[PDB]
Write an enzyme that holds these catalytic residues in place. Sequence first.
Site, PDB file in Angstrom:
ATOM      1  N   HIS B 101       7.074   0.332   5.031  1.00 34.28           N
ATOM      2  CA  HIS B 101       8.225  -0.364   5.718  1.00 34.28           C
ATOM      3  C   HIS B 101       9.503  -0.142   4.925  1.00 34.28           C
ATOM      4  CE1 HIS B 101       5.617  -2.747   8.549  1.00 34.28           C
ATOM      5  NE2 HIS B 101       4.721  -2.479   7.584  1.00 34.28           N
ATOM      6  N   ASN B 174       4.017  -7.538  12.641  1.00 39.92           N
ATOM      7  CA  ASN B 174       4.315  -6.248  13.269  1.00 39.92           C
ATOM      8  C   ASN B 174       4.551  -6.469  14.737  1.00 39.92           C
ATOM      9  OD1 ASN B 174       4.134  -4.839  10.915  1.00 39.92           O
ATOM     10  ND2 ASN B 174       2.062  -4.015  11.289  1.00 39.92           N
ATOM     11  N   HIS B 365       6.599 -11.955   1.825  1.00 41.93           N
ATOM     12  CA  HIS B 365       5.197 -11.843   1.391  1.00 41.93           C
ATOM     13  C   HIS B 365       4.430 -12.904   2.167  1.00 41.93           C
ATOM     14  CE1 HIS B 365       1.755 -11.262  -1.259  1.00 41.93           C
ATOM     15  NE2 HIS B 365       1.690 -12.591  -1.335  1.00 41.93           N
ATOM     16  N   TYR B 388       1.576  -8.308  -2.276  1.00 45.13           N
ATOM     17  CA  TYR B 388       2.981  -8.507  -2.104  1.00 45.13           C
ATOM     18  C   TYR B 388       3.624  -9.110  -3.385  1.00 45.13           C
ATOM     19  CZ  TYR B 388       2.559  -7.609   2.950  1.00 45.13           C
ATOM     20  OH  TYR B 388       2.260  -7.065   4.140  1.00 45.13           O
TER      21      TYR B 388
HETATM   22  C1  HDD Z   1      -3.034  -4.578   0.586  1.00 47.43           C
HETATM   23  C2  HDD Z   1      -1.909  -4.043   0.951  1.00 47.43           C
HETATM   24  C3  HDD Z   1      -1.291  -4.340   2.268  1.00 47.43           C
HETATM   25  C4  HDD Z   1      -1.953  -4.488   3.564  1.00 47.43           C
HETATM   26  C5  HDD Z   1      -3.437  -4.499   3.864  1.00 47.43           C
HETATM   27  C6  HDD Z   1      -0.794  -4.742   4.434  1.00 47.43           C
HETATM   28  N1  HDD Z   1       0.451  -4.720   3.800  1.00 47.43           N
HETATM   29 FE1  HDD Z   1       2.341  -4.956   4.648  1.00 47.43          FE
HETATM   30  N2  HDD Z   1       3.133  -4.453   2.922  1.00 47.43           N
HETATM   31  C7  HDD Z   1       2.512  -4.324   1.708  1.00 47.43           C
HETATM   32  C8  HDD Z   1       1.185  -4.324   1.483  1.00 47.43           C
HETATM   33  C9  HDD Z   1       0.161  -4.446   2.512  1.00 47.43           C
HETATM   34  C10 HDD Z   1       3.464  -4.252   0.489  1.00 47.43           C
HETATM   35  C11 HDD Z   1       3.152  -3.112  -0.447  1.00 47.43           C
HETATM   36  O1  HDD Z   1       3.268  -5.369  -0.381  1.00 47.43           O
HETATM   37  C12 HDD Z   1       4.858  -4.255   1.112  1.00 47.43           C
HETATM   38  C13 HDD Z   1       5.740  -3.063   0.669  1.00 47.43           C
HETATM   39  C14 HDD Z   1       6.766  -3.504  -0.382  1.00 47.43           C
HETATM   40  C15 HDD Z   1       6.731  -5.025  -0.224  1.00 47.43           C
HETATM   41  O2  HDD Z   1       7.545  -5.849  -0.675  1.00 47.43           O
HETATM   42  O3  HDD Z   1       5.607  -5.392   0.560  1.00 47.43           O
HETATM   43  C16 HDD Z   1       4.476  -4.367   2.605  1.00 47.43           C
HETATM   44  C17 HDD Z   1       5.468  -4.381   3.488  1.00 47.43           C
HETATM   45  C18 HDD Z   1       5.417  -4.951   4.838  1.00 47.43           C
HETATM   46  C19 HDD Z   1       6.586  -5.291   5.678  1.00 47.43           C
HETATM   47  C20 HDD Z   1       8.031  -5.115   5.416  1.00 47.43           C
HETATM   48  C21 HDD Z   1       8.521  -6.419   4.737  1.00 47.43           C
HETATM   49  C22 HDD Z   1       9.964  -6.171   4.461  1.00 47.43           C
HETATM   50  O4  HDD Z   1      10.721  -6.080   5.477  1.00 47.43           O
HETATM   51  O5  HDD Z   1      10.318  -6.037   3.255  1.00 47.43           O
HETATM   52  C23 HDD Z   1       5.994  -5.842   6.892  1.00 47.43           C
HETATM   53  C24 HDD Z   1       6.609  -6.398   8.150  1.00 47.43           C
HETATM   54  C25 HDD Z   1       4.541  -5.777   6.582  1.00 47.43           C
HETATM   55  N3  HDD Z   1       4.247  -5.266   5.393  1.00 47.43           N
HETATM   56  C26 HDD Z   1       3.536  -6.257   7.564  1.00 47.43           C
HETATM   57  C27 HDD Z   1       2.093  -6.096   7.496  1.00 47.43           C
HETATM   58  C28 HDD Z   1       1.201  -6.576   8.552  1.00 47.43           C
HETATM   59  C29 HDD Z   1       1.632  -7.228   9.787  1.00 47.43           C
HETATM   60  C30 HDD Z   1      -0.087  -6.163   8.081  1.00 47.43           C
HETATM   61  C31 HDD Z   1      -1.403  -6.354   8.744  1.00 47.43           C
HETATM   62  C32 HDD Z   1      -1.673  -7.334   9.572  1.00 47.43           C
HETATM   63  C33 HDD Z   1       0.141  -5.558   6.747  1.00 47.43           C
HETATM   64  N4  HDD Z   1       1.491  -5.490   6.465  1.00 47.43           N
HETATM   65  C34 HDD Z   1      -0.946  -5.015   5.890  1.00 47.43           C
END
Ligand code: HDD
Lengths: 726, 726
Positions: B101, B174, B365, B388
């Site tokens: 993202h 999402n 987060h 997160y």
């Molecule tokens: C185990 C790791 C992991 C898994 C399984 C998921 N995510 Fe994620 N997601 C992240 C690890 C992550 C992250 C690495 O932690 C991010 C990237 C950098 C951050 O701050 O968070 C992220 C970013 C991120 C963002 C952007 C937030 C922003 O605008 O900064 C959104 C909307 C989502 N995620 C949504 C989801 C949804 C709806 C999931 C499933 C239902 C999901 N993610 C599964």
Amino acid sequence: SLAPEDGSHRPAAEPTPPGAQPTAPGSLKAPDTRNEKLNSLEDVRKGSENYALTTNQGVRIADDQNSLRAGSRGPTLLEDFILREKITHFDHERIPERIVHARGSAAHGYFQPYKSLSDITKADFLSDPNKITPVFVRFSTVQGGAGSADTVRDIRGFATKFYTEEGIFDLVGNNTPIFFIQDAHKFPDFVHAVKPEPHWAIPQGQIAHDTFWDYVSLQPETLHNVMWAMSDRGIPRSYRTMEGFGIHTFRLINAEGKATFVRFHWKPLAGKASLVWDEAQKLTGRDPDFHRRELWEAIEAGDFPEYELGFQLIPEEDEFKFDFDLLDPTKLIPEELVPVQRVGKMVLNRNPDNFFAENEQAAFHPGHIVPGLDFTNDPLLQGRLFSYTDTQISRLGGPNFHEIPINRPTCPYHNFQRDGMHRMGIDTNPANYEPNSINDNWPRETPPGPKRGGFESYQERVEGNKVRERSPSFGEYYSHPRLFWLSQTPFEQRHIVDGFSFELSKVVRPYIRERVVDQLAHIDLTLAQAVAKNLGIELTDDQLNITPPPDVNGLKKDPSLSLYAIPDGDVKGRVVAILLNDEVRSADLLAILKALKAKGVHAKLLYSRMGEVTADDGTVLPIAATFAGAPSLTVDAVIVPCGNIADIADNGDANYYLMEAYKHLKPIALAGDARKFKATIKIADQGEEGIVEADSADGSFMDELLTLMAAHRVWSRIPKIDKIPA
Amino acid sequence: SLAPEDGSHRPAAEPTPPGAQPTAPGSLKAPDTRNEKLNSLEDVRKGSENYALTTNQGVRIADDQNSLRAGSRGPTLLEDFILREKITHFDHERIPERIVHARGSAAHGYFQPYKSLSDITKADFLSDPNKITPVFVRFSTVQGGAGSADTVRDIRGFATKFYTEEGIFDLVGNNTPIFFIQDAHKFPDFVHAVKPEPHWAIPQGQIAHDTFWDYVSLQPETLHNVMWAMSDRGIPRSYRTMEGFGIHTFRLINAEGKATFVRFHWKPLAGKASLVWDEAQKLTGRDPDFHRRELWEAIEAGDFPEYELGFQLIPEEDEFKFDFDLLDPTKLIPEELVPVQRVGKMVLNRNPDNFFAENEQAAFHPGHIVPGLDFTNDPLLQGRLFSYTDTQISRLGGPNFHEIPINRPTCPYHNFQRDGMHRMGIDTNPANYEPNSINDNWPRETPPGPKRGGFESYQERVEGNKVRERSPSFGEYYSHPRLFWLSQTPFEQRHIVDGFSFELSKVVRPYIRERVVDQLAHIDLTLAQAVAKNLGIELTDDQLNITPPPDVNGLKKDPSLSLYAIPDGDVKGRVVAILLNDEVRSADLLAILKALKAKGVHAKLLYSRMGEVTADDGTVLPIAATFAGAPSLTVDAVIVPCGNIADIADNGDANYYLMEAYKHLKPIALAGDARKFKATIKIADQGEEGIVEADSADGSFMDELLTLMAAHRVWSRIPKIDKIPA
Ligand code: HDD
Ligand code: HDD
């Protein structure tokens, strides 16, 4: 086992045309392509086949599909160290991108001189034609982020790391011979102006916005590089088909201590070639990775990018012989005045293995010079020298960035520097200081001399007061823009006018557009009027009466500044779309492919669906992509053989393919009943220059097509494309 | 003074339609908009008017045009601290982008519930219909870098930070109701597969490549979200016209301690609307910032993005009542079985001041929950909770990321945590531990309770062995992709077929295409043959005979899964291109704009050059853009008034404008002589549904056009589009 039984998952380890095999890490595609630097990386290359999946600590994983939980529907346990290591590493994958030139594409290769340059420099890598210097080269855009598009209108970077026997020399250049600004202190102002604007971070990979043009209009020193960026220079066909320049005057230093002023050049052996604006802009949508792809695939195919290193050499007593300052990086040295001496050849012949570890983490810096080279007082270069070591400290995590494999020298390096984050070298020296007695003062200083000596600066005389002041000699802004303008062909001038007109249309504040037009009136009245007409601006009497700037040392043009004035077309490595039908005339196809093969031109077979078609003699023809799938934007010419033309004659996508290619001035060749397509592009019955047509695809039909391709585009077509709705 | 005398450099501090003014930082555009979070940022906002230019140490700069050198053509001096501070800050501007993202666009707003939800949750922000909660919302794609394009085919993120009186709640969702994978442990595998491939870092912002489809073919849990991504859901028209989902089952906890299962929804009050693929792909080239721009401009115009928060609520005792597991994030809860209960309204009404400081640095987060909410054992959610907090340590530089202004709670926060890089808070507590006596044990723990209580987890029963095992209840992969497919209109099904077909054509290794076709045969035979056919693949007899999966709890379809089955169109904030000529019939234009204005539809007046044209009655018409400069891709409809049609009738660009717009299924309206343009799009003399035509633009010409716009696109036009070369 998950691979296909037939082994079609693995590309062959032999050169193959674009699209013939999946692309692969370079050491797997071309394992016997070697040079000293690629061999030195063997200590850190890691394979994978037949090895067990492990943690980073070497513990074998049994189940890489699940977290540890209390019950198979239960909560995840903190003690799952396998999951936390794998997610920790993922969570920390990214590093800051480069501040500028964040978008870039890189390859390994080698350089070799044509002769010893020891009369003019003691640089060991230029001492002997049998001296082979590994290089790593990264080409780049400037403005956009690392995930931005390739075929933007922008300056391109052209950075070469020479792994010499006497140190790393980085020659960190661009694809135009000047820069936008004079003094380093203004670089964050210029860069912020061109970059996405700070409230809403738009636009990406585009100079067409108010703050860029605001800055230009207020800083006439920019106008020269702005001319270059508005020309088709700003939209290269390929990193293989653009020039490179060091931009600054540097010094060569010989064994006698004599200093020669030098400017560096790279001349593309594949010739100079650019897209047109509509094609480039549309190409950022259809394939934002077009240049990265085409570099990787040229190397895979054996179409190695080759460039000749060239030096413009000015004796020290000639410092003041021109009517511009040699230290002014907004001024070019016209090759009519100081010719480019051809000094060596660089061949890029191997892609990386891992883009992040070798390209993203590479660090180039123009202050990485070696004995035999020195700087000048060019006030843009002077401040660069600070920036490139500073930026690496946060970008690459600390001061040991030279230990990251791609950046390591291949020659020895020993000194008294210690520690820093992620220190790899484990120093055994009892001493960490000099002078020392406890290690008999090793490692020791080395006096300068003809070969293998220590670095000593050229003892230039410095006389003046401590001032923040621009040299009066730098205060001339219009004569180089003008020399550039007048050296362009008439179609290159039309494209410059078009570029300014389009750009300034996107400037929301109309006074900024007017102020830019005012500037153009200081360069050339014809240019200023043609841009003005497009913006709905009327020149004043005053503007109509501004005296043109003077010639440059008696020059009123230099054809070496044009992409196309002097033909240098090479068709090897270009690509043709062949539009198929469900019963192709085999005889046309054999003739086409044979003739293309003979010139090293590639082809892609296109149809309305994937799969295969069968030709009239039963030959099964595999389809590479559909019409919509591989647009004309992606090729250099379009050939349509005969056969069942009714199959495609009403296909919107097939018609449009030819309309798009035609609008973008590409050669088109039509055989037999393919000539029915003349109607979609409005071609008269007796033909037109740039459309090849005959009853069948004989030897003359192919020779004509390939002669057109050597001329790149059909400029004569330009007044006809206004009519075509495409 | 560099500003023009007439003040036209400064945008009006009042609502204005897109294009009418340059865009501006939100506190300057809309100073009068406020909420609790925006007010609390005031202490860090910095102005600029009337202030001296300084170093960051507060020293006034005299000359910000030059470095300090010894003589005005001399070397730059190391004592130039003003140069080195400015270049140092520049050199360290960038921070790592988000691992996923990375590309996103954000605004400030507020949320309010329609009624107190205290019977089902003790969450304070839901307790009082008068309690207004500031929010900050970031919308995003998933795969591409921060400098990648907006209108890609991909999932979108929809993340909301609620600054509540009892803590920050982040709802991180999402725009599709499920995810691709079941267990967090596989996230790095899935994400590496969708991300640019590691040898050459291609492709950007695109799922159309070998490794993504290799992963999907080997991991059928993915097929549900893949169906969504292949549908037009993958290419929203705007962040304002897409749905949001939390995906996971969470819990609500009331004051009595009763847990209710919940899945979160956002309903777009502007309705659901998506692009078509050719449009979306071409738009990544013509305006890679289209969604970011559209969101910022709607807010500037007062077309505030509005969404309704909704809950699907399931009692604890119904955990096992469905054919799928409620903890399985690859399953959706059909609205026909559990309706969405309306909860409250969110309105986004202010852009940021600085994109980097507020957007790029925001940290959302899903573990940031508040009393009255709790988790479940969904094993993808469970691993998110680790990621997160972890990823922020490198992205934002350390453990004090909650002190970055945008991330700060507006409610109190006090604890015994200390130090860390760039620590802002200066703690005066004599104690940094508890229990302590030396500060009478403050700050003190707080028991749970109905309001303003300490957080306590719901005491869910856990029973089972410590296993790395998938629940067998999760091992069903095809019934939800089937329900989704059958829920789609015939045109939405065609667009799904075309999405898989186009994507699989870009997969180089044919066996991967065949393996994905086999998966599709397990979902629906019709879907599978229509894709096979486009790929030149023939289903085997075995594939022809696969029994389809069972319906979901008796459902043969659920129309809430379709974008378009149940119309919910809203024209407010859409945009019309008006193609001008050199003598426009003014009564046409007056009637067009009056009708557009009454429905809050915007216009842009396009011509062949910039400047002005003058109407039949002498009215001067300002031009917004050229035909080529603001393509039909960027508008929702095209209207062509009468006048001197001969002026534009053989204009290639003006013709192509109507062709592109026709192809993409947009309403087109033609008045009087503009009817001549029927020939270019091949409309019969008596016309066809979706082309509005008349002698002039009344009453009822505009009601018909606006009725077509309310239906978004002219789906019935689809079989006609293949004919046209566009
Ligand atoms: C185990 C790791 C992991 C898994 C399984 C998921 N995510 Fe994620 N997601 C992240 C690890 C992550 C992250 C690495 O932690 C991010 C990237 C950098 C951050 O701050 O968070 C992220 C970013 C991120 C963002 C952007 C937030 C922003 O605008 O900064 C959104 C909307 C989502 N995620 C949504 C989801 C949804 C709806 C999931 C499933 C239902 C999901 N993610 C599964
Ligand atoms: C003092 C500031 C400054 C100025 C005046 C310049 N640059 Fe620069 N340039 C940088 C500061 C910088 C940088 C911040 O240091 C970069 C980005 C990250 C890095 O490693 O170096 C960089 C990146 C960079 C790259 C990318 C190297 C790579 O591919 O990794 C190239 C080709 C150039 N520059 C070339 C030039 C040329 C030809 C200039 C003028 C003649 C120039 N730059 C002026």
